[PDB]
Amino acid sequence: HGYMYIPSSRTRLGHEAGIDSCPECAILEPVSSWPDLDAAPVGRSGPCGYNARDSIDYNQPTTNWGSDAVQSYSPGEEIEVQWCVDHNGDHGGMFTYRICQDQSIVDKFLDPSYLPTNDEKQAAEDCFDAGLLPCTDVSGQECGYSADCTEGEACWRNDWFTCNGFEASDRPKCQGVDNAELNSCYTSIAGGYTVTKKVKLPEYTSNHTLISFKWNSFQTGQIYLSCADIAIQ
Numbered sequence: 001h002g003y004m005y006i007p008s009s010r011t012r013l014g015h016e017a018g019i020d021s022c023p024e025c026a027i028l029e030p031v032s033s034w035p036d037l038d039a040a041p042v043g044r045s046g047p048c049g050y051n052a053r054d055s056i057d058y059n060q061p062t063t064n065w066g067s068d069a070v071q072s073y074s075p076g077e078e079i080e081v082q083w084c085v086d087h088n089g090d091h092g093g094m095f096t097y098r099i100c101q102d103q104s105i106v107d108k109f110l111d112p113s114y115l116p117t118n119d120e121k122q123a124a125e126d127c128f129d130a131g132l133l134p135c136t137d138v139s140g141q142e143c144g145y146s147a148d149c150t151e152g153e154a155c156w157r158n159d160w161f162t163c164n165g166f167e168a169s170d171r172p173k174c175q176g177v178d179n180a181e182l183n184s185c186y187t188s189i190a191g192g193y194t195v196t197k198k199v200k201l202p203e204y205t206s207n208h209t210l211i212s213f214k215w216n217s218f219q220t221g222q223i224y225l226s227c228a229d230i231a232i233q
């Protein structure tokens with residue numbers, strides 16, 4: 001249970017606008033989430049997420065999200081990205097952020113009068129995967145391998161970020177990355193913890209595009225997706 005927090009995702013805005021009672025609940029399941037992190041179809045979840053709790057499809061703007069960029073950045077800027085994990089749903093695993101560099105694809109997700117089909121969601125997901133923002137593009141950022149993976153498996157990749165080990169004595173799981181205080185970010189079930197990293201934005205301009213967060217579980221078959229509206233100018 002988690003969602004993207006900084007920049008402010010559509011899911012965060014759905015919470016703050018009073019629409020989404022459980023932002024951390026928007027989940028892609030059942031799926032195979034491990035060890036192949038990208039094979040599972042995204043279905044109705046798409047790159048922005050679908051929350052079954054209040055029947056919210058974040059792939060479509062509404063009055064409450066998706067209308068405009070929440071934040072503006074520069075091409076190639078190294079930026080803070082943060083997600084929020086619920087205390088009762090800290091799965092460990094691996095996560096990443098992606099930007100699709102095909103504006104015409106993205107445009108179908110920016111139209112309050114249009115809901116992308118599942119096929120359009122998948123074509124967009126493939127563009128996002130091509131646009132993954134590697135951990136290793138940020139000088140000095142330590143980009144390790146998961147304690148839940150072995151070399152030779154499709155999870156053995158340090159373009160994705162990893163949470164800390166599930167079984168670690170000290171600072172386990174995703175909460176252990178920042179070791180922040182409880183309620184450092186909002187979740188509805190048991191309160192949230194921040195999970196913070198840096199990414200290098202692409203050398204690409206847009207007045208309105210998306211960054212999509214993806215978090216895959218290792219111990220259960222579950223993926224969490226969110227997306228934030230951004231500008232790169």
Ligand SMILES: OC[C@H]1O[C@H](O[C@H]2[C@H](O)[C@@H](O)[C@@H](O)O[C@@H]2CO)[C@H](O)[C@@H](O)[C@@H]1O
Pocket residue numbers: 021022188189
């Ligand atoms: O407090 C009002 C809120 O209650 C329920 O949502 C809870 C949910 O039951 C918990 O599992 C967790 O997600 O916190 C939620 C927010 O309090 C109702 O389902 C919801 O409709 C209502 O707004």
Ligand SMILES: *[C@@H]1O[C@H](CO)[C@@H](O)[C@H](O)[C@H]1NC(C)=O
Pocket residue numbers: 205206207232233
């Ligand atoms: C953003 O919109 C302004 C006004 O139309 C325009 O001048 C500029 O080129 C646009 N930027 C991009 C990256 O398309």
Ligand SMILES: [Zn+2]
Pocket residue numbers: 001002089090091
């Ligand atoms: Zn969960």
Ligand SMILES: [Zn+2]
Pocket residue numbers: 015016186
């Ligand atoms: Zn709040």
Ligand SMILES: [Zn+2]
Pocket residue numbers: 036037038039154
């Ligand atoms: Zn794959």
Ligand SMILES: [Zn+2]
Pocket residue numbers: 073074075232233
């Ligand atoms: Zn600029």
Ligand SMILES: [Zn+2]
Pocket residue numbers: 087
């Ligand atoms: Zn605890």
Ligand SMILES: [Zn+2]
Pocket residue numbers: 102103104105
């Ligand atoms: Zn295009």
Ligand SMILES: [Zn+2]
Pocket residue numbers: 035148149150153
């Ligand atoms: Zn294995």
Ligand SMILES: [Zn+2]
Pocket residue numbers: 219
């Ligand atoms: Zn086990």
